[model samples]
Target: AAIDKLVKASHLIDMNDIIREGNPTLRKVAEEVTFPLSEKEEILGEKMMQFLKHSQDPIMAEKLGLRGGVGLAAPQLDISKRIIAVLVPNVEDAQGNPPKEAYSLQEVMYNPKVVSHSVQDAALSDGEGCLSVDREVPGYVVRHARVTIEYFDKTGEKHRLKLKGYNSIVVQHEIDHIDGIMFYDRINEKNPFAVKEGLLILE
Candidate 1:
């Protein structure tokens, strides 16, 4: 089982565990997780979060052959469950002091969804990437500038969060995975780099 392979004590998620594009599983909508998750499901979330921390750590990432990532969905691991993990770093100051909060957001969410979003669109200036995407895909992955989201934590505690800027984009990207959508799908087919009027382009 995919969950077993990932949850095994000896196992560590790496690039090989990620499913790339063209896998039919990636195109299927993930199933919503219910309350009181199973032991496997609970441990899976912890493992996913650990993977993100490893990806962000230079030494660990190099030792494990991992690509840096801010977010990950269970579907990317070939597990069709509505579980996602995110860890966005808070940038340091000019003198190299860490931000008051080491991370902007860090959590493993289950059955997450966007309840509301801003009318003003946004996109990363350099475009987006995925742990499941191997090639360079250049284009603005247009998304909501702000979003109001709701989800359950590992312990079944419900949480509502409002996010903007890069944090918003990262969460949105992971949510799209559960919905069976890809970031490139939002790119303009005819003009990939063209930014529509009123779009808030983020650097």
Candidate 2:
């Protein structure tokens, strides 16, 4: 299992440092899973979880210089396969209102696709950023207000789920990573902050 592989590798090296943008690896389209996942996935799935967890643990986060992110993809870790890990942090809305809890729904998705989505478009209330992108790319990343995704889990079992609001935004952001795309790529060049028609600015 990927989690088991993480334990073995942790003692050998650290996975907390992210590969920043401008690296050629971030531009490559990742390959599909080869049954049992790849060398990186087995490690990234766990690394992403802990990194994200550290981000939420204010104390440990500051100690490690970790930004405490909620999403990450294969490209950011090692780029060996197409996969993403996400954990929506307890955050407030566009207006600064927060979510119910710190967070716990961490998911690992393999080759996920947006099978269906609401025609209504939306953007993160505070816009979006990536763990791999180090610049302040303030812009809007319009996405489906609600989406239905089809993906496989670590157990190799298929599953589908409907996501809305903040969860939808988080997943879409990671999906962009799979295409070697960044969240800021969705921003309108002429109007970076403009929320287009039907674009719900979710907090």
Candidate 3:
């Protein structure tokens, strides 16, 4: 139902201007770019912040069904860089109720990499879409179901994270963009059913 709502949203903004595919900027994998708590990375960080502010708004989240809306590389938005942002949803406190405390939102990741992955049947295939390539959903693609990632946090601290489920999928999707790869690239040819009439079908 959420996806249906998202599909019907009349105000869905076009992200083409922000994402650049096949550009040199998208192709260059970023190095470990660090940022101090008080030191902002300026251009990339600012853009990321702007995106986060927009994506996390209650209205936007409601229409987008973004339990957690995150942005990918500039390439996906049509900009170029390794910058990204993620909204970690609020969780219930120890009292077993939603906390009054504000949820923590994360900022741009400079350069991110997968340091490890699950070895036991970790392959996952699913439908994917792109903000830039609107209306064109890609077929099911196989990716690591679980991954251990390393990247610089917003505070310039190094973070090594192990993520599974949707989190890992989101990270892997964005990382692919940083490498000039689209979700379509990962489409599974063996499973023609994954690509039905050129549109990705949830399987």
Candidate 4:
């Protein structure tokens, strides 16, 4: 099992460690983690964040044969825990200069929830992808344009923040994993790519 391999040694996570679709864990609601996390839980959170960093690093990703990912949840690792990691890189301009911020949002959130959300809906122009999903399922995964979320960290400290744009979409995607909801689940069944009026399409 992936968790077994993980707990066995201090190994960098590769695509092989990621669980694929059809796994029962991916469909089941993940359990909420308690404060003062267990050793394993703490390590898993750190590992998840490290995995995202590796996935984004060209050298490390190529060496490990990893697919680029912006976010990951415990369920994706076959662990039924409400933990997720996100690392969205800041976009660079034509002049090869990135934004003032290094990353759009980077965090390992535990038991995250959307306390509030904007009525306006949004979706990526090209759609979304998940590390756990191998096949291509093209569709606009509709989601809230903005969200105010609450979550706890490994230190048992609580945090709350409002997010919008890609950051909001990414957090929502990870949160859904803990709730046993897939991105495609939100896609329109009859019209996968059908976008209604007033939906904000992010480029």
Candidate 5:
């Protein structure tokens, strides 16, 4: 029984490693990611949940300093499929107190797409970081101010979501990873000043 407990604990540790490893790189694009889930997809979903749940683990949370990451995608960690997780931070009930808790932990998306974006809002430029990239080098990228997205949840249920502000930026950033596009690709070359400042850390 003691040995079994040890094994179980070991499994949890491994799951945490997997979640961290899968970030940033897993979001890369590849061939199409199938929808209408399959057994293989289901298993992958379970694995993803394992990671997501582990995110709430105190040790992992502290190490990652993920005060409340609102979005994650399979490709971001190098998983090579269309899977994503999102949590809406600061959601409140009628009283305006924070929600009872952060959004439930789950794999919220598979094969997600940006259905639309706002054109009127000024383009927002912000520093971006990827788990796959060197941490010291933070890149600035300009992204849409808001977006409407369509995707299937882990259970294969279809849903459409609209997000704005920081949430919108997070979602767009992860989706771009799905297309093999990194924030660095979006930087304006003519702005040599911005590039030099951001790239200095890479040196």
Candidate 6:
């Protein structure tokens, strides 16, 4: 869904060792990338994709015990750079299958902001989890089912895309990392499943 080169394997980091909750690094805000990413940042994005690839491959992921995810933030790797990788799954429940739809890679210097969002918010019926978070806190994160974001690509070129459903959620979740925010932080701490009236549920 990124509209770039797609990958089938991960390299650089083993990825089996994704950063976990309560890690001090996860709490620190990231620094803005100087206009065009450096060589190291590009490689970092590549490595993140590899783990994402594994998550889509049932066989490889199961064999490796990889949670394989669609997005990862900079601090998750201790880079301290403000960058995030986001993917849109082309297939339903892509967790245990080959990537049917090709998507690509990389980071951005532009601050990707939600230009707009649907008033009708929604949540994944099954709830949400993270690769860094190995345990389940058990809650639904209320997110705008539809959102439009502006971000840069691997190139210095700017990108603005209107996204919906899972894609919207993926982008928002990863960007939160750019600001050193975590998913559980968004979950209602007191009432995990509490729902707001007049919103859609994407079950």
Best candidate according to TM-score: 1
**TM-score, prediction 6:** 0.80
- List runs of model 2 lying over 4 Å from the truth: 1-8, 11-16, 38-40, 90-104
Q: TM-scores of all models?
A: 0.98, 0.83, 0.63, 0.96, 0.65, 0.80
* Model 1 agreement with the true structure over 1-203: per-residue lDDT tens digits: 88899999889899989998999889999999988999999999999999999999999999999989999999999999999999999989999998999998999999999999999999999899888888899899999999999999999999999999999999999999999999999999988899899999999
**Which candidate order results from sorting by TM-score in descending order?**
1, 4, 2, 6, 5, 3
How much does candidate 4 score in TM-score? 0.96
lDDT of 4 by residue, 23-109 (tens): 889999999999789988998898999999999999999999998999999999989999999999997899998789989899999
Evaluated at residue 144, the lDDT of candidate 1 is 97
Candidate 6's C-alpha lDDT? 0.69
lDDT of 1: 0.95
RMSD of each: 0.7, 4.3, 9.2, 1.2, 7.6, 6.0
| Candidate 4: worst-modelled 10 consecutive residues by lDDT | 1-10
Model 1: worst 10 consecutive residues (lDDT sum): 129-138
Cα miss at 201, model 1 (Å)? 0.4
Q: How accurate is candidate 5 locally (lDDT)?
A: 0.56
Runs off by more than 4 Å, candidate 1: none
Give lDDT: candidate 1, residue 33: 92
lDDT of 2 by residue, 34-111 (tens): 667655556666666676777767887777766757777866765546788888766577998767676635788888
Q: Give the Cα-based TM-score of candidate 1 against the true structure.
A: 0.98
Clashing pairs in 3: 18-77, 18-78, 18-79, 19-77, 19-78, 19-79, 20-78, 74-79
Better of 4 and 5 by TM-score: 4
Separate clash counts for every candidate: 0, 7, 8, 0, 15, 1
Model 1 pairs in collision: none
Per-residue C-alpha lDDT of model 6 across residues 73-171, encoded as one tens digit per residue: 767776666677765555545476756465633333245777888888878877877777868678888888899888776676887788877777878
Q: Number of clashing pairs, model 2?
A: 7
Distance (Å) between predicted and true CA of 83, model 4?
0.2
